[PDB]
Every structure is written in C-alpha cells, then in structure tokens.
Nucleic acid binder design. Structure first.
Ligand SMILES: [Mg+2]
Ligand SMILES: [Zn+2]
Ligand SMILES: [Zn+2]
Ligand SMILES: [Zn+2]
Ligand SMILES: [Zn+2]
Length: 1223
RNA sequence: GACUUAAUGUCACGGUACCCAAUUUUCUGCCCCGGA
RNA sequence: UCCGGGGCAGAAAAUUGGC
C-alpha cells in the first residue's frame, strides 16, 4: 500500500532550479535538467530553499527498471506474465505527457492470456498506471492505482550548502577542444544524498514487480543510487588590508603579490611553519632580516603578524586560513594596482530469444602516474543560484567539500567515450537534444556503461604549477603571461568503478580497460582531466578485478545486493570467496595482446619516447615562491614536486626534484619553433603551421604530451643541492651593487657527476614523418646543448651534456705594447695604483633593431666556443656555500674561510664570473653603457652618482631606446643575452698554491677587502664619473704570500678571508655558447675572450691584490646552421669586429683606438712569457703610522688625498690613465 | 499536508571545463680610503 | 685631538591573456 521508500545517492547528483512546466521552457538550464533533482526557493531573496526529486522522475526510473526486469525474464516476473505496456498517447485523444520518451523501449513477446483493461491488468500495466482514474491532469491522490510522491531531501537550507555550480564540458574528439559548455549544480551526497518519498500502490498484483524495480534503479539525477523500502573572511580582509598598507609604507606594493603567492603555498607546510618559526630568517647578521617575512607591519615583523593572524584565526583550518589570506592579500593588491544546453517516435526493441544479459562490474584503482589536473571554475563563479578579475589561482583543481581530489563521473566518462571512440576506430560527436538515439558504436556502448565519481582518500592541498609564456622575440617572459595551476600529486589513487549492462562484454571496452591498465610491461594510459599536453592526468588502472552478475538466472541477487552500488569499495577489498551470491569473477577477460581493437587503435595511439637528460651543470628550474617558505633561505631554489605514495598512503617525505613538464614542453616547442620559423608568427589563430600541428594552438589540442623530467640521479649526490652565490659588480666601483647580491640553489650538477633527468613524451598516431623529424631534431637540439633547462642558462645553469634515448622508443697573435712606465722602470721601484678607470667617453651606440630570438637566422652565427682558461696568477674563486669551508672558524671565530668553488668535488669556475668579467670587458671594448651602476649612491654631494654619470652611459631600460652592444650581446631585463657562458671545469696544472706557513697549505689568508670609495675617484662635485674600474695584472699576491704570518696577526680575523687558491698554470675549460650573433659580434666576443698574447683578464677575488690573472685561449670555435671554424675564418671574424669599433669611433692593431689602447694596457700582463718586469701594484696606506707602510715613501692617502700636494684634477687624470706612477 | 511532481513515454551516465603559453630575463661573491 | 671600519645580501619586470 503506502510504501515509504528511501533514495540515497553514492556520488554527487545533479541539481537544478525548479520551474513549472509552462515556465520550464523559458530557461535552458531547467529544460536540460528535467531528469535531475529539483530546487525550489523558500521564502524571499533566493537564498534558501529545499531540494527534491519529482515522483515523475522516480516513476520514470522505476518504469525503465520494470522494462529491463521484464526483458530479462521474457515479459514475466515471478510467474505472472506481462504485456508490452503502452508508451504512445494520441494528440487527438488528449494532451501529451510532460516528458516524451526518446529512447528505445525494451519489448518482449506478449504471453498474457487476455488483454489489459480497467477490470484486469498485468503488473506492467498496473505500475504504468494505464487504467486508473488518474491521468495527464492531476486532481487528487487516491485516483492513482500507483502514486509516486515527491522525494523530499532527508536532512531553511541554502543552495551553497547543498550544491556547487560546476561548469561541465563537451570536448570535440578531433580538435581536443571544448565545442561548448554547460553548468550543473552537483549536489553533495555525503550530507544531502538521502531522499525520502512515498509510493502508493492500490493493486497488490504488481507489488513484487514494484519493489524489485526499486532495487533495480541504478542511477537517478546523474548519480548511482539504492532505493530502499522503509565572518572570518571580513577580518582576514581587514588584516590583509593592514598588511598591504604597511607594505605600501615601505614602497613594497609589488611584494604583496609575492606574499599572496607565498601565503597560498603555506597550506602545504602545515601550521608549524608559522607556529614553530620555520620561515627563513634572513642572513646571519642582517639587521633588516628577511626581505619579506621581516617587513615591519604596524611596527612588528611579518612573521609575528602572521603568528598573530593564525592565533586569531585558529578556529578555521590552516588550509582555509592560508587560502583566504593569500586570496585577500591578492584581492587588495588588485585595488591598489559558448554556453549551450540540449517528431517523437516509439521504438520497440526486443532482445533475441535465449540471450544472456550480464552486468559486468569493473572495480579498479585509478593511480595518477603523472601529476594531474581536473578543471573547475573559480569559487566566485562556482556559486550556485548566482548565475577587477579576482583569481588568485588561475586554475583551481576540482575538490570536494572535504577538499579531497575528485575525478568526476563526467570527466571519467568523457575520457572513456574518447578512448572508446579511438578503440572502435569511428564514432560521433555527441549531438545534444536529438529526438533519435545515436546509432554509433560508441554511443551504443556508452548507453550500456555506468561509472562512478571517484575521490581520493587524500585531502592535502594542491601543488601550484606556475607557468609562463616566453616571448619569442626576446626570450624573456611575455608581457602578461604568468599564471598558476592547482595540480594533484602523482601516485594518487582513485577508486575506479565501471559497470557494463549488456549481452556480451564488448571487445572495444575491454581494450580501453587494458589500455588504461598499468600492469607490468606497458604504462597506464588513462588520460583524464585537462592540460594533458603538459602531462596533467595520465592515470594508471591497477588492482583490476572484473566481476560479472548473471541477470537472467540470478536477477533477485542483483536486486538484493542493489548491484553492489556504493559498495564497490568493499568489492575491491574482499576476497574471492567473500563475494555476494550471484556475483562471479569474470575469468573470460581478454588479455592485453589478444585484443583486436587495443593492438591497432589504442596501443599505437600515443607512442612513448622516454629518454634521460644528462645535465653536467647546476640545474635551476627556479621555484621562488617555495624559496620564500622554506628554511634553506635562498633567493631561488630548484623545483621539486610532492609525490604521493600508495604504500605509505601519504606524500613521500623527500620531494622529487624535476624540470617541469611545462618547461619540458616549452623547450621542445621553442626548439621546433625556431627551427621552423613558426615561433616568429605574430598570431596563431586558425594556424596550420608545423609547430601548431604538433604542439596545438588555441583551436586544436596538441599531438604531443610532455611529462615531467624526473631526477633519477639524486641518490648518488652527497650534497644534491649546491649553494652558488651571485652578485652584480658596479662598472665604476669594482665591488658589489647597493642591492644586487643573491644566491641560487640549483641541483649540484657537474661534468663528472651529472644529473640524470628521466622524462618522457607521447607522440600521437598520425604524426607526419616531417613532424617526427622535427621532434627528433628538437630532441637533438637539447642533446647538443642549444636549450638549457631552467633558469640562468646564459650563466651556465641547466646545460645538457647529452641525451640517452631508451630502448623501447687557435691563438691570438696580437701583442699590445703595454705601458712605458713599467718598461722604463725595470728595477720595480715604481709603484702603481691597483685599479685605474677607463674614460671611454659619452658616446654609446644603441641598436634599436633588436635581434630576435624567435629563429636561428641564416646570416647570423650560432654555435659554441671551447675556451681554455689558463691562470697566470694564483686564482681565487671562493666556495661561498660554506663560510667554514676550510674548517678553521673554531680557532678564528668570524673569519670567513672558503674552499675553491667546486660542484661534487671537482674544481669549477661558475660561468657567471666568466660571463660577468667578459661582459665587463665587452662593455669596455664596445663603449657600451654602465649596465650595473649605482645610480642611487650619493657623494660626500649636490647630486647622486647617476647624476654624475652621463645619460648615454646609464643602463639600458627597455628595448624602445635601443640596446648598447654589451647589453645587446649579454642581455637586459627585457632581452635574453645571446651568449651563454658555461661553468669552467678543471683539467690540468699545478692544482694548489702551496704555502708552508698556512694551516691549510693550499690556502692563503688575504689582506682585507673594503668597499670601493667613489669619493677618491670623484674628489669634488665638479668632477664626473672617471669610468670603468679595471685592475692591473701584477704579482702582488707574492707579497701577501710572504706576509701570511703578519697578515694573520695584525689584521682582525673577521675582517679578511682565507681561501683555497689555485697555483699559476692551472687550466680550466668553459664553453661559450652563442646564438644569432653577428659576423662582427662573434669576432668581438672572440677578441673579448683572447685579446692578445700579453693581454689577460682579472677573475675572482683579489683583483687589486694581483690574484686571478686568467688567460683565456680558444681551443675550437664550432658553429652550426655543425662545423669547426678554421683559423682563417676566426681571424676574419675578429677583423670585422675591429671596423665596427672604427665606425663607432669615426692583423688588427687595437692600440690605435684610444679607449681600447687604455683598456688593453689596463689588462696588459708585464710578467708574461720571457719578461723581467715585476711592477709593484698596491693601494696606499692612510698615514705614516699605519701598518704596511714603507718608511721614506710618500705613498699615503694623507698626502695623496691632500689637495695642496696632489690637486683634485691631477688625481683623476692619475686615476684615468692606466699604469700611472703613484709613488 | 503544502512547499514541490504528474502518470500509457525523461538516452542527460546525451556533453572531459577542454584548448593554447619554458618561473623566466639581466646581474663577475666581489672589494681601500678615510671617520669624528 | 684621534685609530680604524665592513658593505650589499636581492633590484626591476611580468601575476594572466586569447579561443
Ligand atoms: Mg493513470
Ligand atoms: Zn498489460
Ligand atoms: Zn554516438
Ligand atoms: Zn602556428
Ligand atoms: Zn646597456
């Protein structure tokens, strides 16, 4: 009679706003959602209401379930036969029903004795309500032979509490892009999944068929179901506004976005990073502390303010607090700066006689083989019922209300339909609102396939994948192109459920299941979700146990267990003997190699190209946001990803370092782009270029999918990350800039101990032979070192030594005369200043025709220079990773002692010093701008140092005014440098300068190194900037070596340093990779490397002390278009670089140019080859009472600084004339 | 009860939020004259 | 009339556009 039944959902069911049938046609969302749960509004304001399922929808699910139940038993149920029913109402007889059937109606052979009427009817006709007083117009409730009441939600209620408006999608198969999209309210089944309704039934004759069909209704409102018969955001925004205003007080509004990113990544670290003060604390003796976390907000530091914020907001979660405060810091930073929905016929379908219809349930685990991404709209746009940009995360991952990662049913079905279309070899694009069912072979099996929404048992916050678009022309970031993606970890496991209701299990669906399988030999190939081309969402199907119900003989056991709907998790973990009755294992599951549609359609669909990248350089794919939130306290640390482990059911405690798949993708896309010229196209709208076919565009998906490059070598490194300090040296003052000092934390890669980066990509079936050749050429381009991975590639980072592909796929003969003063004074009595200034002039040529990076120009020169660096003096390149490298700070506290620079033991010179000293030589040689200049530094006074410097010598800001030749070759902030200086590895020579008195014999305690003082170079306000400071080549290191005892006892230990020093005669080899260089530019760069026989370079510490005279000798110039450039063409390159400087001024003899003659005598080596000259070069002491003063000489700053003895004009021309006598 | 259904007919599990985009560009861990 | 002294320790740019 009154059968009160209960409807519980086991996945997120779809909800829609209720409209009456006259008003339902006005809204396309409700017309599309006629088969959903309905939502009316209660009260006013459209904020509260109540969800329900219409009884017509429950009747439609039941009547569909009766038809399938009667088709299994040939129109019978428990003995009593049933007729075919009726599913046709005439329009002339009466009004049509509110829902018209479009599907095929399951029919049988009518074994009923008499016809069905009002006097006596079959149980099919009773449950249809064919012959009762109730009809198309409802008047009263007891006219119904069977009544279905509305199913109210068994829980006023707000719509945001129950449902979340999610934009779903329709992806085109051929292009891989969404044709259109539509929005549904996927309501939460864990709190609001239970629905209670009433089913009245006057006739007892259809009682057994009704309750069994209640147990046979598998899905309703988009969700699997069993039917059983019974404000801190405001205060966070205010405090974020306080923090933004406080940052605006120190003129640091640009750091608020950095802080908003850094707060949003603190949800991964837990509350202990703020509670236990695990944020980095700045330098060891820095009064300013950290540059971000110690910014004074209302008089106290930002770390203490975040402590107070977390104590004030401890009632919410740490994840929610870091998400909203990171969002609110982002939102206030913004104030201070194809939607598509949707002739009736009756289709009688009778199954063949004696056929066997089975229910194949596939329970498995969707393991994320790659980091994954499932797309969702922004939470501001995800609000249901509410159908300046405000996106802190550009792409959020789809989560629950419990923040667990979600594979939707829709995205699993869409990837299954795509893979079944591939497996069948044909298919349809899914037409919407069609009156006729699609007869395509995919849609037939899609109608038989039922899946489940899977959620991981994991609710940790998503990792953030920052992506940029590189500007093709400048090889810097594109203006505007920076965005972030919430991704899930690899190894994450999702409960996979597939249900097939059909006669035979199709050979194409079992092909897709075996395609998705990880198994042993193959890879798991379930591409689910979005950004697949950047390897987001390649899932593996593991722990597969396909079971099968028998629905023709054991259909009561299917109804009794309700198809194990919602109990599929228990189905995956029980044994074989613990299975319910009627559920047998499917032992006839076809194997991988015995499948006809798998072998020719799915297996060759994406071809794996796995390979290992040999990185013989320190690899830095920078994660600056993670650098701010980690206690290592570096400005740039290498990228690492959190990887979930299914064995430990948690993230692995050591994050795997990786070059990002997006970086892996964009290097290949650049490499094809500059080889084809497709990177230089202005727009790629409706483009069928070679790079747009391969890598996709705004319209087509990519035919290549790139995975992350796993560091598979990290266990073999004792110290896997190297600390490399970096600094920018002012061109006028030989020391550091006023703000430009920093450090990187790359993976410690070296030529003898390289980093192995195992990464793979996938190649689409149908790839052209030219397109296959372009990828291998791009693969060979990375193997040939043309594209360094990560940041600082021009400084020597991420240089690729080679690529291993897996099996399953010269002298410069110029002699400068030098200076006459050391040649005339052969007794070494004459005393010279350690540095002199190069006053080249105020004429800087700026090329507005900026050389593009978008292609390898055929007339321009690209290649590699192998250079041997020979130390002419003892050379100091300190390993400033350890301030106690020589292990002597116990005896001398505060005495900073460094080893020589080394990565994984072997002695290295970083290419930053090789680039920076060559840049300082190239900018001096080419009359360039002062690219690193202390403009903000004052004098002791009318103007700053930037006022004293000429406007042409000022550093190049932007590309609009042109670039100076040093800034054109070596780059600006708006332009990647076209030269790349590798790290110099050690080969041969006497390794260490051995001193008997020092506690390490290889070491040397030096004199003190104080900051360069512009007041000596600029004595008054009437004097300009003297020019580029260059240090002389002298053997004043021999003085320091012989007073090692005296230096250590009359100089305070924390004032000077002790360093491991090479001896004279050591050979280093660095590669200078160059791209798109001129005929004259390479020759000037070759001249900048090897300027002459007696000309060298000053490198590393102790340049005023005579250390670091390095002789760079070119071994081999190799250029590609790969060939070896002969000596005749190398000299011919250098000749056209000479008349380029001649045309700027208005056997190359470089001494006839006045600024190159002064520069080359500044870099002239008087003690080179067979020469008895040993010029004495040292700075004056202050007074006669200062230590290190030779008695009887006037070499003091009291007399040289006195205007009466040495006038101010004479001191500048004594400083701007190299090798001038100072004593 | 109503909110909130229509009953001889709901393929909406009929629709992958998908497609593009290299956290990168520049920068020598360097260094001498004063301070009240 | 006095006999020393460390500095910088990141700066700038993009923080989303198109379909
Ligand atoms: Mg009726
Ligand atoms: Zn009947
Ligand atoms: Zn179809
Ligand atoms: Zn294109
Ligand atoms: Zn410049």
């Amino acid at each position: 009679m009154n059968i009160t039944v209960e409807l519980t959902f086991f996945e997120p069911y779809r909800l829609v706003e209720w409209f009456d049938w006259d008003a339902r046609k006005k809204s396309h969302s409700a017309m599309r959602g006629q088969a959903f749960a309905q939502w009316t509004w209660k009260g006013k304001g459209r904020t509260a209401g109540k969800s329900f399922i219409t009884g017509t929808l429950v009747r439609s699910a039941v009547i569909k379930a009766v038809e399938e139940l009667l088709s299994l038993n040939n129109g019978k149920w428990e003995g009593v036969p049933c007729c075919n029913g009726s599913f046709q109402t005439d329009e002339s007889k009466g009004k049509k029903p509110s829902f018209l059937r479009k599907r095929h109606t399951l029919q049988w052979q009518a074994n009923n004795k008499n016809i069905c009427d009002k006097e006596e009817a079959c149980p099919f006709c009773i449950l249809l309500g064919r012959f009762d007083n109730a009809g198309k117009v409802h008047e009263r409730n007891k006219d119904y032979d069977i009544h279905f009441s509305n199913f109210d939600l068994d829980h006023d209620l707000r719509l945001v509490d129950i449902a979340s408006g999610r934009i779903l999608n329709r992806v085109d198969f051929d292009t891989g892009k969404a044709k259109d999209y539509f929005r549904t309210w996927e309501a939460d089944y864990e709190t609001y999944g239970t629905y209670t309704g009433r089913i009245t039934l006057r006739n007892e004759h259809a009682k057994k068929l009704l309750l069994a069909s209640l147990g046979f209704v598998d899905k309703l409102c988009g969700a699997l179901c069993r039917i059983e018969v019974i404000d801190h955001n405001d205060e966070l925004r205010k405090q974020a506004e306080v923090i933004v205003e406080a940052f605006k007080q120190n003129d640091k509004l640009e750091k608020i976005r950095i802080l908003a990113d850094a707060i949003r990544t603190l949800r991964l670290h837990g509350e202990g990073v703020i509670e236990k003060d695990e944020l980095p604390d700045g330098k060891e003796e820095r009064d300013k502390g950290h540059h971000l976390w110690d910014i004074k907000v209302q008089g106290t530091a930002l770390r203490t303010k975040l402590k107070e914020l977390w104590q004030s907001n401890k009632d919410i979660g740490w994840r929610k607090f870091t998400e909203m405060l990171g969002s609110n810091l982002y939102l206030i930073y913004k104030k201070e700066t194809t939607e598509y929905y949707s002739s009736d016929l009756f289709i009688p379908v009778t199954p063949p006689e004696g056929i066997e219809t089975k229910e194949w349930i596939i329970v498995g685990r969707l393991k994320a083989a790659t980091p994954f991404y499932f797309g969702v709209q922004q939470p501001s746009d995800s609000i249901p019922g509410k159908e300046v940009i405000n996106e802190h995360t550009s792409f959020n991952i789809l989560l629950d209300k419990e923040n667990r990662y979600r594979i939707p049913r829709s995205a699993l079905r869409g990837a299954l339909r795509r893979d079944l279309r591939t497996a069948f070899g044909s298919g349809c694009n899914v037409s919407l609102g069609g009156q006729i069912l699609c007869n395509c072979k995919v849609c037939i099996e899609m109608r038989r396939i039922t899946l489940k929404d899977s959620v991981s048992d994991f609710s940790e916050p998503p990792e953030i994948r920052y992506r940029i678009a590189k500007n093709p022309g400048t090889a810097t970031v594109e203006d505007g192109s920076l965005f972030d993606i919430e991704v899930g970890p690899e190894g994450l496991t999702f409960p996979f459920v597939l249900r097939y209701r059909g006669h035979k299990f199709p050979e194409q669906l079992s092909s897709v299941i075996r395609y998705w399988e990880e198994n042993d030999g193959k890879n798991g190939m379930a591409w689910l979700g979005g950004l697949d081309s950047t390897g987001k969402g390649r899932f593996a199907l593991k722990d597969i146990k396909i079971f099968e119900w028998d629905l023709n003989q054991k259909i009561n056991e299917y109804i009794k267990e309700r198809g194990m709907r919602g109990k599929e998790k228990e189905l995956l973990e029980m044994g074989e003997s613990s299975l319910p009755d009627g559920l047998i294992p499917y032992k006839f599951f076809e194997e991988r190699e015995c499948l006809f549609p798998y072998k020719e359609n799915l297996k060759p669909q994406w071809s794996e190209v796995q390979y290992t990248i040999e990185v013989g350089s320190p690899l830095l794919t920078a994660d600056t946001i993670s650098a701010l939130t980690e206690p290592g306290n570096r400005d740039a640390i290498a990228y690492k990803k959190r990887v979930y482990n299914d064995g430990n059911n948690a993230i692995e405690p050591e994050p795997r370092f990786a070059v990002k798949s997006e970086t892996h993708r964009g290097i290949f896309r650049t490499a094809v782009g500059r080889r084809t010229g497709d990177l230089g196209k202005e727009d790629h709208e409706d483009c069928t270029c070679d790079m747009c076919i391969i890598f996709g565009n705004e319209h087509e998906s990519s035919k290549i999918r790139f995975e992350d490059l796993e560091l598979i070598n990290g266990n073999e490194f004792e110290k896997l990350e190297k600390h490399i300090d970096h600094v920018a040296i002012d061109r006028f003052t030989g020391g550091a800039l006023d703000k430009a000092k920093f450090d990187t934390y790359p993976l410690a890669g070296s030529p003898k101990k390289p980093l192995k980066l195992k990464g793979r990509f996938w190649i689409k079936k149908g790839f052209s032979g030219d397109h296959k050749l372009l990828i291998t050429t791009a693969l060979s381009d990375i193997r040939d070192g043309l594209y360094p991975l990560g940041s600082k590639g021009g400084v020597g980072y991420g240089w690729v030594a080679g690529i291993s592909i897996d099996d399953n796929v010269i002298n410069n003969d110029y002699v400068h005369p030098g200076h006459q003063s050391p040649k005339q004074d052969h007794k070494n009595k004459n005393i010279y200043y350690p540095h002199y200034f190069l006053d080249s002039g105020s004429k800087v040529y700026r090329e507005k025709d900026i050389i593009t990076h978008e292609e390898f120009t055929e007339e321009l020169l690209s290649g590699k220079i192998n250079c041997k660096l020979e130390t002419l003096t003892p050379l100091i390149i300190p390993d400033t990773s350890d301030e106690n490298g020589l292990k002597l700070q116990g005896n001398k506290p505060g005495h900073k002692n460094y080893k020589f620079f080394n990565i994984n033991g072997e002695l290295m010179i970083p290419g930053s010093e090789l680039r920076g000293m060559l840049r300082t030589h190239f900018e001096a040689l080419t009359k360039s701008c002062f690219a690193i200049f202390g403009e903000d530094s004052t004098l002791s006074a009318s103007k700053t140092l930037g006022g004293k410097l000429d406007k042409a010598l000022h550093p190049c800001t932007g590309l609009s005014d042109g670039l100076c030749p040093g800034c054109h070759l070596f780059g600006t902030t708006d332009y990647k440098g076209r030269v790349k200086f590798g790290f110099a590895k050690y080969e041969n020579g006497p390794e260490w300068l051995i001193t008997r008195g020092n506690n390490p014999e290889r070491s040397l305690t030096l004199g003190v190194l104080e900051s360069p003082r512009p007041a000596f170079s600029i004595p008054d306000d009437e004097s300009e900037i003297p020019g580029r400071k260059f240090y002389l080549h002298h053997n004043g290191w021999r003085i320091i070596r012989q007073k090692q005892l005296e230096i250590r006892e009359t100089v305070q230990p924390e004032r000077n340093v002790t360093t491991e020093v090479m001896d004279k005669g050591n050979v280093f080899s660095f590669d200078v990779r160059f791209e798109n260089l001129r005929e004259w530019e390479l020759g000037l760069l070759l001249q900048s490397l090897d300027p002459g026989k007696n000309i060298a370079h000053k490198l590393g510490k102790g340049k005023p002390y005579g250390f670091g005279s390095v002789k760079i000798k070119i071994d081999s110039l190799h250029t590609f278009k790969i060939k070896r450039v002969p000596q005749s063409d190398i000299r011919e390159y250098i000749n056209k670089g000479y008349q380029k400087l001649i045309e700027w001024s208005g056997l190359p003899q470089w001494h006839v140019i006045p600024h190159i003659d002064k520069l080359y005598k500044l870099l002239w080596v008087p003690f080179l080859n067979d020469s008895k000259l040993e010029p004495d070069v040292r700075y004056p002491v202050l007074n006669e009472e200062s230590k290190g003063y030779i008695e009887g000489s006037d070499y003091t700053y009291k007399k040289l600084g006195d205007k009466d003895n040495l006038p101010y004009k004479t001191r500048v021309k004594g400083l701007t004339t190299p090798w001038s006598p100072w004593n």
